[PDB]
Structure 1
């Protein structure tokens, strides 16, 4: 069966990216919380080239 998780690095950085979060007052508050909460990773860790 075709499931719900089809990995795509572009789609990730694009969707949950840092520059992504930073553009929307909504995404800016996410980073804000994650920081307060101590989250080691503020954005979904993902690497390409």
Structure 2
């Protein structure tokens, strides 16, 4: 069946990318929290 996640290299980067998060106050706050937790994968940009 058509499952929920249909992978796309563009949609992912344009929705959860670093530039998408750095365009609104809410995204900057989310990035600040992830830096506080010291997440190695800060955003979906750093896939590898």
Mapping of 1:10-49 within 5 angstroms?
A: 10-44=10-44, 45-46=46-47
> Partners in 2 of 1:20 and 1:46 — Cα distance?
16
1:6 paired with 2:11, answer: no
Give the TM-score of the pair, scaled to structure 1: 0.87
Aligned-residue RMSD, C-alpha: 1.3
Aligned length: 47
Give the TM-score of the pair, scaled to structure 2: 0.89
Where has structure 1 moved over 6 Å in runs of 4 or more? Answer: none
Q: Return 5+ residue gaps in structure 2 as ranges.
A: none
Contact 1:34-1:42 at 8 Å conserved across structures? yes
